[PDB]
Nucleic acid binder design. Structure first.
Lengths: 96, 423, 150
DNA sequence: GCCAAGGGGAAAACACCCAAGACACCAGGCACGAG
DNA sequence: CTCGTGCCTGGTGTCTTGGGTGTTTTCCCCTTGGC
C-alpha cells in the first residue's frame, strides 16, 4: 500500500537512524531548570548539559523499563505495576 | 348470565404487593372486597378503558385500565375460567378479556410503554411484565440506568423490591432518554445518600455506598452487602507510602461472607486528590441533630477526608491514624510481605496493621513477643517476627537495614517484649 | 482464497404462554427455576414472568437486617462485560431489564410452608446450578466445533 | 476400680496452581496548546 | 504554523481474588495398662 501512514511510518523505522530524544526537550529543559532551581539558584544550564541529562535519562528510564518489563513478565503479568519498578530498583540496589 | 358474579380465589396487585379479594363484577362495575385490607374497591364501567386476560403468579389474571390513569392488575383467575368472566365482561363493560400476552420467550430486551400507571416492558408488542408506577417509593438515576425502588411494603410475600433498566442512548434523537424516561416514570411514581464509585481493595471492586439509617448498603456491580454500623470494631486511616493515596479500613465483626470467603475488614483505597460531592436525603435539622454541626447536608471535597468524617458519624468510631511512625523513607508503613504476598505493615500508635490482602491487624496487647531477625535485603537488613498471646504467630519478611532502626526505636518506645532484648 | 462465516440463535424460554409451567412456587409468589426449559420463573409484581437462564449473568444475595435480598443480574449492554460481543442482544437499542432484586424476610411468617427467605435461598442456589450447567453445555459447543472425526 | 500414657486417625495451616471477572490501559477521536 | 498534548469515550485483557491440592503439622479418639 503506497498510501500515507503506510510508507512513512513503515520506512521511518529505517529512516530512524536518528536518536530523537523521547522527552520533549523544552518541557524537560524546564524541569531541569526547575529541579536545578530546587537545588540551587544561579545555575546556568548549558544546552549540552541539558542534552546530556535528557539522553541519559531517556535511555536510563528505558533501562528501568527493561527491568520493569522483566519483573512484570516475571510475575506472569504484561502490565507493569509500580511494585515492578520497585522490585527492579530494589534488586538493582539503585535506591537512595 | 348473572347480573353480578362472585369469586374468592382472585387477587389484586398494589404497591409491590399482591392482595386477595372477593371480586364482584356488576352491571355498575367491578366491586372487589380485598381481604388484606377488607376494603371494597369499586371501579365503574365508566372509569375503565381496557381489559386484559393474561398470566400472573396465581395462574391467570384480569388487567383493568381506567381513564383516571390508574391501571389495576387482578390475579387468581384460572385460565380455564375465561368464558364465565369474558361473557359477563362483554355484557356489562362492553369490553373483552384481550390477549395482551406476556412474552414467555424469557428475554431481557424490550420496549417500555407508559400505559398510564401500568408501565409495560414489552418484547416487541408483547409485554414481558408491567409495573404500576405508583409502586415506586424511591428513585435514582445513573448513566444509562433507571432505578425503581418499590414501597417497602412489608405486608407482601417474596417481593420484587428493586428493578433496574438499562437504557441504551438513543441513536435517532439527541435528547437524554434517561432523564426523559426517568421523568416519565416519575410522572406516575411515588418517591439516605450514595457515595458513588468507591475503590475497594477488600472486597476487590468498585462499589456505591447507599448509606442507610443503621447500615451502609455497599452496592456493587454483581453483589451487594449491608454492613450494620454495630458490627464495625474500628475505623483506620492509613496514608499510603506513595504519599498520593490513603487506605481507609473498617474492621468488621462479623466479617462479610463473600460467598464461601469471609472478610474481617473492609479496605478502601482513595487518592488524596480524588474529590467528590455528597448530599444527604435528610433535613438540615436532622443533619445538625446527628452531626453536631461538624458537617452539613451538602458538602464537597476530598473523598478520603469527607468519607472519613461521614462514616465516623454513622458508626461513631473515631478515625484511627498512625502515630509519629514515619519510616526512613518517610512512609507511615513499611514495605513487607506476609503469606504468599506483599503489602504494607503499618506501625499504628497503639497496634500494627498489615494493609491489603490478606489484611491483618495486631494490637500491642495481643503481642507476646517479637524480634528483628537478620533480614533479607542485606546482612544487616531485617525480618520481623510476631507471636500472639493466642499462640498465633505472624511474621513480616524482607525489610531494609534502614527501617531496622526506626522499628527498633519504635518498639522500644512502645516498650514491647523483643526476643533479642535480653542480648 | 476467501474468509469464514458464522450463525446465532435466540434464547427462547417458552414457545407460547400455555407451554410455560404452573409450578407451586409460581402460585406461591416464589421465585422458581424450570430446569427442563433452562428458565427461571419469578413473580414480577404479581406476574409469573419467565427469564431464560441464558439471560442471567449472575446472582447475589444479601441479608439486610430482617430481610434476605436475592439479586439477579442479567446480560445487557454495559453489563455483558469482557466479551467482544458488545451488544449481544438481537436489538441492542431496546431497553433492558438490567437486574431484579427480590427480598423476603429471614423469619418464617404465619402459615407458610417455607420461610420467605427459604424460597430465595433455594432459587439462589438452584440458579447457580442450572446456570453453570448451561454455561458448561454452551462451553462444550465452543470447544467441540472445529474438530475432525478421528 | 480409679486414674493415667501411649499409638493412631482426622483434621488444620500453609505454599502453591487453576478460573473468573472487573477496572483500568491502550486505542480512537475531536479539541486546545505552545514548541 | 500546525504538530503535540489532552479530555472523553468504549473496550479489553489482563490482575486480581475464589476455588482448590496435598503436604507438614497439631489436637483428638480410641484402648490398654499400672498403682
Amino acid at each position: 500500500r503506497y498510501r500515507p501512514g503506510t510508507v512513512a511510518l513503515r520506512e521511518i523505522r529505517r529512516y530512524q537512524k536518528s536518536t530523537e530524544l523521547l522527552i520533549r526537550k523544552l518541557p524537560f529543559q524546564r524541569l531541569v531548570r526547575e529541579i536545578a532551581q530546587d537545588f540551587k539558584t544561579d545555575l546556568r544550564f548549558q544546552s549540552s548539559a541539558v542534552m546530556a541529562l535528557q539522553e541519559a535519562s531517556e535511555a536510563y528510564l528505558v533501562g528501568l523499563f527493561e527491568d520493569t518489563n522483566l519483573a512484570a513478565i516475571h510475575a506472569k503479568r504484561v502490565t507493569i505495576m509500580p511494585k515492578d519498578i520497585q522490585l527492579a530498583r530494589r534488586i538493582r540496589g539503585e535506591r537512595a | 348470565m348473572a347480573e353480578t358474579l362472585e369469586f374468592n380465589d382472585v387477587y389484586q396487585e398494589v404497591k409491590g404487593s399482591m392482595n386477595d379479594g372477593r371480586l364482584r363484577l356488576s352491571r355498575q362495575g367491578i366491586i372487589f372486597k380485598n381481604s388484606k385490607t377488607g376494603k371494597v374497591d369499586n371501579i365503574q364501567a365508566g372509569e375503565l378503558t381496557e381489559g386484559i386476560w393474561r398470566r400472573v403468579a396465581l395462574g391467570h389474571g384480569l388487567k383493568l385500565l381506567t381513564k383516571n390513569g390508574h391501571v389495576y392488575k387482578y390475579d387468581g383467575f384460572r385460565e380455564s375460567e375465561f368464558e364465565k368472566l369474558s361473557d359477563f365482561f362483554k355484557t356489562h363493560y362492553r369490553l373483552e378479556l384481550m390477549e395482551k400476552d406476556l412474552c414467555v420467550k424469557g428475554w431481557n430486551w424490550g420496549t417500555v410503554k407508559f400505559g398510564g400507571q401500568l408501565l409495560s416492558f414489552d418484547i416487541g408488542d408483547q409485554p414481558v411484565f408491567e409495573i404500576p408506577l405508583s409502586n415506586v417509593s424511591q428513585c435514582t438515576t445513573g448513566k444509562n440506568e433507571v432505578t425503581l425502588e418499590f414501597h417497602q411494603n412489608d405486608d407482601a410475600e417474596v417481593s420484587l423490591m428493586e428493578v433496574r433498566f438499562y437504557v441504551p442512548p438513543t441513536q435517532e434523537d439527541g435528547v437524554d432518554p434517561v432523564e426523559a424516561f426517568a421523568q416519565n416514570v416519575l410522572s406516575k411514581a411515588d418517591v439516605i445518600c450514595i457515595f458513588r464509585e468507591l475503590q475497594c481493595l477488600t472486597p476487590r471492586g468498585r462499589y456505591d455506598i447507599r448509606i442507610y439509617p443503621t447500615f451502609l448498603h455497599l452496592h456493587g456491580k454483581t453483589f451487594d452487602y449491608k454492613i450494620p454500623y454495630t458490627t464495625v470494631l474500628r475505623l483506620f486511616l492509613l496514608p499510603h507510602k506513595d504519599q498520593r493515596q490513603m487506605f481507609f479500613v473498617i474492621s468488621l465483626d462479623p466479617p462479610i461472607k463473600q460467598g464461601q470467603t469471609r472478610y474481617h475488614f473492609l479496605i478502601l483505597l482513595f487518592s488524596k486528590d480524588e474529590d467528590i460531592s455528597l448530599t444527604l436525603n435528610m433535613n438540615e435539622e436532622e443533619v445538625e441533630k446527628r452531626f453536631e454541626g461538624r458537617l452539613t447536608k451538602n458538602m464537597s471535597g476530598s473523598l478520603y477526608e469527607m468519607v472519613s468524617r461521614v462514616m465516623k458519624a454513622l458508626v461513631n468510631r473515631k478515625i484511627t491514624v498512625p502515630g509519629n511512625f514515619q519510616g526512613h523513607s518517610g512512609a507511615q508503613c513499611i514495605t513487607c510481605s506476609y503469606k504468599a504476598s506483599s503489602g504494607l505493615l503499618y506501625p499504628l500508635e497503639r497496634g500494627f496493621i498489615y494493609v491489603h490482602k490478606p489484611p491483618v491487624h495486631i494490637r500491642f496487647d495481643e503481642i507476646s513477643f517479637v524480634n528483628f531477625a537478620r533480614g533479607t535485603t542485606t546482612t544487616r537488613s531485617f525480618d520481623f517476627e510476631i507471636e500472639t498471646k493466642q499462640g498465633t504467630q505472624y511474621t513480616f519478611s524482607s525489610i531494609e537495614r534502614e527501617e531496622y532502626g526506626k522499628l527498633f526505636d519504635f518498639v522500644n518506645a512502645k516498650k514491647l517484649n523483643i526476643k533479642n532484648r535480653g542480648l | 482464497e476467501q474468509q469464514i462465516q458464522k450463525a446465532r440463535k435466540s434464547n427462547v424460554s417458552y414457545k407460547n404462554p400455555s407451554l410455560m409451567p404452573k409450578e407451586p412456587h409460581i402460585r406461591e409468589m416464589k421465585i422458581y427455576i424450570d430446569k427442563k426449559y433452562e428458565t427461571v420463573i419469578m413473580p414480577v409484581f404479581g406476574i409469573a414472568t419467565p427469564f431464560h437462564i441464558a439471560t442471567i449473568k449472575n446472582i447475589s444475595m444479601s441479608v439486610e437486617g430482617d430481610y434476605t435480598y436475592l439479586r439477579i443480574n442479567f446480560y445487557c449492554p454495559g453489563s455483558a462485560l469482557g466479551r467482544n460481543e458488545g451488544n449481544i442482544f438481537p436489538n441492542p437499542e431496546a431497553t433492558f431489564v438490567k437486574e431484579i432484586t427480590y427480598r423476603a424476610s429471614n423469619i418464617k411468617a404465619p402459615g407458610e410452608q417455607t420461610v420467605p427467605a427459604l424460597n430465595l435461598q433455594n432459587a439462589f442456589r438452584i440458579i447457580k446450578e442450572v446456570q453453570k450447567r448451561y454455561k458448561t453445555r454452551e462451553a462444550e459447543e465452543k470447544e467441540k466445533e472445529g474438530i475432525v472425526k478421528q
